[PDB]
Design a protein around this ligand. Structure first.
Ligand SMILES: Nc1ncnc2c1ncn2[C@@H]1O[C@H](COP(=O)(O)OP(=O)(O)OP(=O)(O)O)[C@@H](O)[C@H]1O
Ligand SMILES: [Mg+2]
Lengths: 68, 87, 159, 298, 289, 87, 54, 101
């Protein structure tokens, strides 16, 4: 974030962009995903950081139960 | 003059460089692009074929991928340093 | 103005971000972040001297040209790691090994403050200390306490 | 100014433009048109890229009377430099039909604009010329050495056509004609042989008539044309050279290889005779069968 | 009942055509834009006499790239030169795509529609043309309303027309949203055709130029030697070759890439030339001296 | 039947580029990775129930605009068919 | 015939008829038009092969 | 006349941009086959009218036209190393007697 934002796409290609409808400065952080338009290249929604937790949360199993 | 430089630069348009991979003929020369894929490009009769040599950098139009002219060979600081040393 | 309004139009977002690997010199080789390599006519509006290796630059999306300059992008992970001088463990509290503390302090602390003296005599000051051998000897720890004494920003880092 | 003007290449677009401009001002039948020609210069090949009509009024009572709207040529130039900086003022076209001594004056006004020597491209829009209807001429300043003052004149520079790649693919696609000369087949170059002679015969006549005009109309002795004609009579091929005897042996080689290649085509045609003939013999058999097969069902 | 809503056959002059290939193709990758100047007659005949490039802009093509400030300014210069004629539309170049209007280029079209209701939007694709004239198409708006109430049939009443078909995604998007296409035709004068080919004096001057005789020798030598090689192969062709099934014969005797035929071709070219060569030399020698 | 049929042709232009459903957010949008390095925050539109879709499922996405047009896949790979030798 | 580009995108591309199939059919480097994406002409085997002949 | 036609036809074929090659992984009843288009990712795509889900067989290699991915022809044709080894090898010579001793 440079007070516009410097985004990096996953194909690896960098752009300076801006806010779309109205995207608060405080929402966009290093590592935060962003939704940007195909070709008009502007932020709509900040998206929760990283897609990698979702992948690994499948493996995760909750409090297994066995009687001691 | 400086603001005119920009308007001029936009009309000059970024150039693709390759380098002579391998002479094949006077009329057709094999270059490998800096950006990537291997090509067979052509040479204009404006630029003598004797200048063009293996490992010399060359500049080509995007539009048609044909060599317009020679460029001076890439500045490599390393072989400059090697020469200098002794004094 | 006519030129400046044309320049603004190009500057309208989006535009490409790239870096200058070098200026060949006049002409400039940019390394783009699209993973291609472009030799472009050096935009005379942009000072060649201001540009350096790995100077970040704005590059127009269509015809690749050095439109403008940008502040080099920064890594918060690196920033966060810097300034970890605190707490000063203090050499005292770092268990055992008097000898190593005395040795590190010769290599580091003394040259830091006495730096004028080093210049005069002209001999090199210690250019880095490597610590190696068994873990658990507090390689970590030492560096934190020492940096704090030398008042010098402590990056804890791994290459 | 600049003296590099060794070659002139001409986009066909220019040519197309020059008639277009002539008709939109409604100038015709000895009304003249002056426009600017734009393109590259300070370079050996002057590349005429474009042309554009200018305000021009023509007076017939005084031929040294005309209008040009000087301010307009500046203004238009400003716009086109913004479109493309490579275009610069490089002179002015005239529609002809012919060059004049008023075009000398006109040249002078464009000279001020131009940082090259102004190129005077005489485009005859009517195209009465058998060949090239376009001449290119460059105003040069030289002492005409004869006991006459410094003379300003328009010296012929051969010109050729040229097409940008981008235009050219489209030029070719538009065209589809069989051509007066394409350098195609035997019959096509053969037409050109008849044409090329009649070309020379008209061409030589022009020379004979100038020689009359010098001593009958007192055209200024140009020692330069007459000098070139001396070189024609001097370097002239003659017969009884050992060069005739050499051509004479060569004649015999050219017919002899032709003769043998004629004989070889005899063998190829004779081959096809046999192959088609063999098929016929078989055709007789399949025909007879038809009749035979009809009997068997009956 | 109502309007035909007819779409003009867009009659593109050769002069206009040549400036479009030049400015657009050269200007790759950066898009270029401009107006079309013409006259509209009938209800189906629009003659586009001229085109020009409006000064480049870094917004490339957008509603705002194009301007009235540019429009007026250029007009005024041509106004004096008397070569002024009404704006009949607008062009722009897509060098990276086929012929279709972006969502943006429709909006751009919509401002020119308000100006003049016969306004065309013409998408020029010049690098991925291999003949030049192909894959350039002219378009006109159709309303959102028009699609619902079915006013597409009216426009092409009693005419065969051409509806374009290349690009499947981008086309069907264009055909059922961006615009309605009808045929695009090129016309030119027979004064101009003479100019496009260009007559020269050096067409005929080259016919009495006698090229050197080292070059005649080389051709004599070369052509004959070559046919010696394929004449061995020809002997092989006809050694038997008379047993059934034609296909069988062509693989066994290598009548594929036919050696008989290749002998004939090399023979004919050389035969033709050696006759030109004697013919020119005879003419030169008497004629000069 | 006629219902199913009419709808299916309309919605589905083809080819259809498959995805993997990484997560759901309840607002009829999903986050999928396509075979392209850019992933795509998609709408769920039409057909397949929201409930029926559980994360880790492979999914059919529509090529013009990426939307969940259904499932018929169930992480079908050729590897399973090869192994499968009940025969 | 079946070919790979420089990048390896496997194209099925037509062989312009009445060209070599006597050495073309074994692997060899070949040239494809860029725009057309078709096999329009052939390369000698010398191109893009190390010159071991010493 | 036919020769002028022939040269023209050769011209028109070459134009075709794209043109690939997949393999039918499995067949479904929806007038489609799942194809792993080999240079690309996967595509589930409808059949061309000329060759249908009936005719198709699992694991058969196929031709495809352009970026459409409509069926062209089925290819029997398979690249395998054994086949490649045979071509180096050619027709094995030679009579028993020569070996015979
Ligand atoms: N010299 C010391 N005195 C007391 N405790 C120690 C000492 N050295 C290490 N320890 C204890 O062990 C912990 C772990 O240190 P660790 O084994 O990571 O040592 P190190 O020498 O920094 O090695 P490395 O970074 O290679 O793993 C410390 O947090 C500390 O509590
Ligand atoms: Mg440690």
């Amino acid at each position: 974030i440079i007070k516009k934002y410097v985004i990096n796409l996953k194909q690896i290609a960098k752009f300076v962009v801006g806010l779309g409808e109205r995207v608060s400065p405080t929402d966009i952080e290093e590592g935060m995903r962003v939704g940007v338009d195909r070709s008009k290249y502007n932020i709509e929604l900040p998206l929760p950081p990283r897609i990698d937790p979702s992948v690994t949360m499948m493996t995760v199993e909750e409090k297994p139960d066995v009687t001691y | 003059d400086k603001t005119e430089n920009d308007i001029k630069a936009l009309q000059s348009i970024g150039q693709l460089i390759g380098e002579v991979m391998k002479e094949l003929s006077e009329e057709k020369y094999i270059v490998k692009a800096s950006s990537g894929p291997r090509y067979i490009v052509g040479v204009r009769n404006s630029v003598d074929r004797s200048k063009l040599k293996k490992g010399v950098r060359v500049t080509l139009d995007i539009t048609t991928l044909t060599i317009m002219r020679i460029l001076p060979r890439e500045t490599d600081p390393l072989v400059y340093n090697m020469t200098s040393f002794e004094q | 103005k006519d030129n400046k309004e044309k320049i603004k139009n190009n500057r309208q977002l989006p535009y490409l971000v790239a870096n200058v690997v070098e200026v060949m010199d006049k002409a400039a080789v940019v390394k783009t972040s699209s993973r291609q390599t472009v030799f472009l006519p050096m935009v005379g509006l942009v000072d060649p001297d201001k540009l350096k290796p790995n100077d970040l630059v704005g590059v127009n999306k269509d015809s690749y040209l050095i439109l403008d300059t940008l502040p080099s992008e920064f890594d918060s992970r690196v920033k966060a790691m810097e300034v970890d001088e605190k707490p000063t463990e203090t050499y005292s509290d770092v268990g055992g090994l008097d000898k190593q503390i005395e040795e590190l302090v010769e290599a580091i602390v003394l040259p830091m403050k006495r730096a004028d003296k080093f210049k005069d005599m002209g001999i090199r000051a210690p250019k880095g200390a490597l610590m190696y051998g068994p873990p658990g000897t507090g390689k970590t720890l030492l560096a934190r306490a020492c940096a704090a004494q030398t008042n010098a920003t402590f990056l804890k880092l791994a290459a | 100014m600049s003296l590099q003007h060794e070659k002139v290449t001409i986009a066909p677009l220019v040519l197309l433009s020059a008639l277009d401009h002539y008709e939109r001002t409604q100038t015709k039948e000895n009304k003249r048109c002056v426009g600017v020609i734009l393109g590259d210069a300070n370079s050996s090949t002057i590349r005429v890229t474009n042309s554009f009509a200018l305000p021009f009024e023509e007076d017939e009572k005084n031929s040294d009377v005309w209008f040009l709207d000087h301010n307009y040529i500046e203004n238009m130039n400003e716009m086109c430099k913004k479109i493309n900086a490579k275009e610069k003022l490089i002179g002015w076209y005239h529609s002809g039909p012919k060059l004049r001594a008023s075009d000398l004056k006109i040249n002078e006004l464009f000279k001020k604009y131009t940082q090259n020597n102004p190129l005077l491209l005489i485009v005859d829009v009517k195209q009465q010329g058998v060949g090239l209807p376009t001449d290119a001429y460059v105003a040069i300043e030289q002492v005409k050495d004869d006991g006459t003052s410094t003379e300003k004149t328009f010296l012929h520079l051969p010109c050729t056509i040229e097409a940008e790649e981008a235009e050219e693919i489209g030029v070719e696609h538009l065209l589809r004609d069989v051509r007066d000369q394409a350098a195609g087949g035997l019959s096509i170059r053969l037409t050109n042989q008849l044409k090329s002679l009649k070309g020379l015969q008209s061409k030589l006549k022009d020379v004979v008539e100038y020689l009359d005009k010098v001593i009958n109309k007192e055209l200024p002795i140009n020692h330069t044309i007459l000098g070139k004609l001396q070189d024609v009579f001097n370097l002239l091929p003659n017969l009884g050279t050992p060069d005739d005897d050499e051509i004479d042996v060569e004649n015999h080689d050219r017919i002899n290889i032709s003769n043998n290649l004629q004989k070889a085509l005899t063998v190829k045609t004779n081959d096809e005779l046999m192959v088609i003939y063999i098929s016929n013999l078989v055709r007789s058999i399949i025909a007879f069968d038809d009749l035979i097969e009809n009997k068997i069902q009956n | 009942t109502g309007r035909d809503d007819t779409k003009e056959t867009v009659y593109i002059s050769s002069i206009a055509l040549l400036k479009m290939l030049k400015h657009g193709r050269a200007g790759v990758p950066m898009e270029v834009m401009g107006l079309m100047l013409g006259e509209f007659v009938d209800d189906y005949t629009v003659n586009v006499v001229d085109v020009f490039a409006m000064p480049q802009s870094g917004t490339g093509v957008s509603v705002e790239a194009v301007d009235d400030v540019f429009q007026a300014k250029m007009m005024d210069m041509l106004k004096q030169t008397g070569r002024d004629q009404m704006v009949v539309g607008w062009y722009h170049s897509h060098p990276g795509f086929g012929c279709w209007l972006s969502s943006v280029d429709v909006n751009t079209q919509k401002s020119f529609e308000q100006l003049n209701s016969r306004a065309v939007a013409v998408v020029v694709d010049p690098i991925q043309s291999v003949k030049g004239k192909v894959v350039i198409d002219a378009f006109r708006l159709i309303d959102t309303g028009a699609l619902i109430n079915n006013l597409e049939p009216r426009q092409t009443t009693s005419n065969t027309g051409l509806l374009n078909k290349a690009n499947i995604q981008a086309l069907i998007h264009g055909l059922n949203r961006h615009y309605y296409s009808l045929n695009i035709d090129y016309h030119k004068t027979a004064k101009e055709t003479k100019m496009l080919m260009n007559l020269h004096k050096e067409q005929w001057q080259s016919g009495l130029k006698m090229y050197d005789y080292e070059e005649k020798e080389e051709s004599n030598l070369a052509a004959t030697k070559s046919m010696v090689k394929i004449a061995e192969q020809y002997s092989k062709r006809i050694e038997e070759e008379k047993e059934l099934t034609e296909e069988e014969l062509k693989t066994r005797y290598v009548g594929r890439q036919d050696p008989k035929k290749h002998l004939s071709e090399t023979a004919d070219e050389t035969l033709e030339n050696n006759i030109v060569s004697v013919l020119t030399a005879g003419v030169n020698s008497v004629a000069i001296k | 039947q006629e219902e199913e049929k009419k709808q299916l042709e309309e919605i589905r232009g083809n080819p259809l580029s498959i995805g993997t459903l990484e997560e759901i957010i309840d607002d009829d949008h999903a986050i999928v990775t396509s075979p392209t390095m850019p992933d795509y925050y998609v709408s769920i539109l039409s057909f397949v129930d929201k409930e029926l879709l559980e994360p880790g499922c492979s999914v059919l996405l529509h090529h013009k605009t990426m939307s969940i047009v259904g499932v018929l896949q169930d992480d079908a790979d050729p590897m399973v068919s090869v192994m499968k030798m009940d025969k | 015939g079946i070919v790979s580009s420089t990048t390896g995108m496997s194209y099925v591309v037509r062989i312009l008829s009445t060209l070599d199939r006597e050495l073309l059919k074994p692997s060899m480097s070949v040239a494809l038009h860029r725009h057309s994406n078709a096999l329009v002409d052939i390369l000698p085997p010398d191109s893009d092969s190390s010159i071991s002949v010493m | 006349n036919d020769k002028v036609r022939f040269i023209k036809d050769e011209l028109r074929l070459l134009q075709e941009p794209g043109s690939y090659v997949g393999e039918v992984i499995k067949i479904v009843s929806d007038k489609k086959v799942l194809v792993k288009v080999q240079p690309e990712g996967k595509y589930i795509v409808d059949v061309a009218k000329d060759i249908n889900v009936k005719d198709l067989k699992a694991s058969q290699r196929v031709c495809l036209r352009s970026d459409s991915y409509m069926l062209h022809k089925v290819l029997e044709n398979k690249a395998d190393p054994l086949v490649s080894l045979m071509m180096v090898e050619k027709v094995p010579d030679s009579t028993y007697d020569m070996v015979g001793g």
